Nucleic acid binder design. Structure first.
Ligand SMILES: [Ca+2]
Ligand SMILES: [Ca+2]
Length: 293
DNA sequence: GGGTTTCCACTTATTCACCTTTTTAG
DNA sequence: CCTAAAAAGGTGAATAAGTGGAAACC
């Protein structure tokens, strides 16, 4: 099929990226050439998602990104109009909305060909200073007279379950937890999570009310921090999580892990997880999920 | 035809996904 | 006692984000 547009924006909120290149250049009149676009890089196993997007928007080029990943890149200027038309109708809701807004300001600058005149590049740099990781060291030297306005924090709520399915297609984990505990000796526990940096803590907190279950767990690694929304109560997983993605279909290989997750759920609901044979079946499903596929 | 646009190969750091065991709740 | 639910603990890598070089093109 071709990707539902709210799924697509949810996936883009999770995996997308806007780019603005401002390249030192001797062959350009202004001394710099530019390139603007939107891009997605995934593991090779989900090349299909990217092809589905390419054919859904009917723009963008696909290339390998190393030997284990592949990317969809859209920088052909005329084709950016399809990106904008899509994100005006179906807007992002994470902080990435801020990066989209800058992409859009840079689009105007180039639509008027202002990116050739010296003043035109000065505005692209001003814009670029607050996009993603901002200006390179080399760029701050070329333009130390730059002062750019502070960037508003985005705070937007989940628009609907389609957005959620696309976002969960990016950030979610459907997990079968096997706990030592032993007379049978293995408690089967389903876990659902969604992972996201603290910068979108508001959206992450809203998930408890949006889905009617779960809890936020704060996580750390070196100096970095982020958040998990987690559900571990079987009834909530069986009555609240599973129907949402049944009605609102995941994409990529992660749909297969969801489908296996649902097989284990059916077995827990039938108490087969408390029998030896059912336990064995669950181990086999777990074996071939996620990293084991 | 040559200044600019587009494309394609390729790289890098950390926010994701995914994993295990222990402890507490019921 | 027994089973479920949550907490405690951990990290490899698929992401986000970016770069070099050059052919395609107006
Ligand atoms: Ca993300
Ligand atoms: Ca993902």
């Amino acid at each position: 099929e071709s990707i539902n547009p709210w799924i697509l924006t949810g996936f883009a909120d999770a995996e997308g990226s806007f780019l603005l290149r401002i390249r030192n250049n001797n062959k350009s009149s202004v001394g710099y050439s530019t390139e603007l676009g939107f891009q997605i890089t995934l593991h090779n196993k989900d090349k299909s998602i990217l092809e589905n997007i390419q054919s859904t928007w009917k723009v963008g080029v696909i290339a390998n990104s190393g030997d284990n990943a592949v990317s969809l890149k859209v920088t052909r200027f005329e084709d950016l109009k399809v990106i904008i038309d899509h994100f005006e109708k179906y807007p992002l809701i994470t902080q990435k909305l801020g990066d989209y807004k800058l992409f859009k300001q840079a689009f105007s600058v180039m639509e008027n060909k202002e990116h050739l005149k010296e003043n035109g590049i000065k505005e692209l740099v001003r814009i670029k200073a607050k996009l993603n990781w901002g200006l390179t060291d080399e760029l701050k030297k070329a333009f130390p007279e730059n002062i750019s306005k502070e960037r508003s924090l985005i705070n937007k709520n989940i628009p609907n379950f389609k957005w959620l399915a696309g976002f969960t297609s990016g950030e979610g984990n459907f997990f079968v937890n096997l706990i030592k505990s032993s007379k049978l000796g293995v408690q089967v526990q389903l876990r659902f999570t969604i992972t996201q940096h603290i910068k979108d803590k508001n959206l992450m907190n809203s998930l408890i009310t949006y889905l009617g279950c779960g809890y936020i767990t704060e996580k750390n690694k070196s100096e970095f921090s982020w958040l998990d929304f987690s559900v571990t109560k079987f009834s909530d997983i069986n009555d609240k999580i599973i129907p949402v993605f049944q009605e609102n279909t995941l994409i990529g290989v992660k749909l297969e892990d969801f489908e296996d997750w649902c097989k284990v759920a059916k077995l827990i609901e039938e108490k087969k997880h408390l029998t030896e044979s059912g336990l064995d079946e669950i181990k086999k499903i777990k074996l071939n999920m996620n990293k084991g596929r």
